């Protein structure tokens, strides 16, 4: 009952346009590589957007 939210959905495509060829299936090193250099404002606004980056590139290999 807890589907995601819009201002982190749109924020990644100005962000993962930078660094597509990374961010693999194991979701630990990419998570801090999602937290890499950006001007973030908290930790779980970005762990959600890393889990956004986790789930939404893991399923490109579903076709």
């Amino acid at each position: 009952g807890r589907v995601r939210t819009k201002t982190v959905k749109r924020a990644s495509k100005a962000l993962i346009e930078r660094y597509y060829p990374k961010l693999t299936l194991d979701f630990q090193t990419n998570k801090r590589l999602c937290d890499e250099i950006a001007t973030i404002q908290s930790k779980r606004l970005r762990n959600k957007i890393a889990g956004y980056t986790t789930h939404l590139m893991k399923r490109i290999q579903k076709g």
Binding site: A11, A14, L15, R18, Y19, P21, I37, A38, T39, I40, Q41, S42, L45
Partner: protein, 223 residues
């Protein structure tokens, strides 16, 4: 005497909300903009960093010598401590009283209900006011409904750290036909304030890398 640890910071307002009720009410024509409280022992730092700080000399003893001994002599601080000091306040977009007291001499003449309002506030609408809210009510026209809900700005609120950027004011005047209540809300910029968070979480900029490397028939390097 023998002050406890629960008797001066809950009792901050016995002196700090004493001055802030005083120069909201006594001679608030000055455009009051807070006092820089660094209370040294046996001295009292009055810093009315206001719009009319040419009145810190004045006659050098006409009204200042009153104000040495009015706030300081109603709770009866013992004399021999009080010092007065001032300096001009500036950057008049980022303060509620700056445009409020720019209306506290226009409420007799018959200016428009809007013309002075969105004109002076465009000192900061182009330099850091996104979403403001001004209501100038009372009874300007004898009817059933007496309220002008003036709306202006390019609205960004709210992420709940709201106190980082807000100004608030509410004023009154006793005219011929009842009170005229002027409450505003002026919105400072965290991007013009240069402090702490550059912006509440909307303004997140993303830098660009070097162009990513090829297969790179590589090298002979020995520095």
């Amino acid at each position: 005497a023998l002050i406890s640890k629960k008797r001066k910071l809950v009792a901050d307002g016995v002196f700090y909300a004493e001055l802030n009720e005083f120069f909201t009410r006594e001679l608030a024509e000055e455009g009051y903009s807070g006092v820089e409280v660094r209370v040294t022992p046996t001295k009292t730092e009055v810093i009315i960093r206001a719009t009319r700080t040419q009145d810190v000399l004045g006659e050098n003893g006409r009204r200042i010598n009153e104000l040495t001994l009015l706030v300081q002599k109603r709770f009866k601080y013992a004399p021999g401590t009080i010092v007065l000091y001032a300096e001009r306040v500036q950057d008049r977009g980022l303060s509620a009283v700056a445009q409020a007291e720019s209306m506290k001499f226009k409420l007799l003449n018959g200016l428009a209900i809007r013309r002075a309002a969105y004109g002076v506030v465009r000192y900061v609408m182009e330099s850091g006011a996104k979403g403001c809210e001004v209501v100038v009510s009372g009874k300007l026209r004898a009817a059933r409904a007496k309220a002008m809900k003036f709306a202006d700005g390019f609205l960004i609120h709210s992420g709940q750290p709201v106190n980082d950027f807000i100004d608030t004011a509410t004023r009154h005047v006793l005219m011929r036909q009842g009170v005229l209540g002027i409450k505003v809300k002026i919105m400072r910029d965290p991007a013009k304030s240069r402090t702490g968070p550059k912006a509440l979480p909307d303004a997140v900029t993303i830098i660009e890398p070097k162009e990513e490397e090829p297969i790179l028939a590589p090298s002979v390097k020995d520095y």
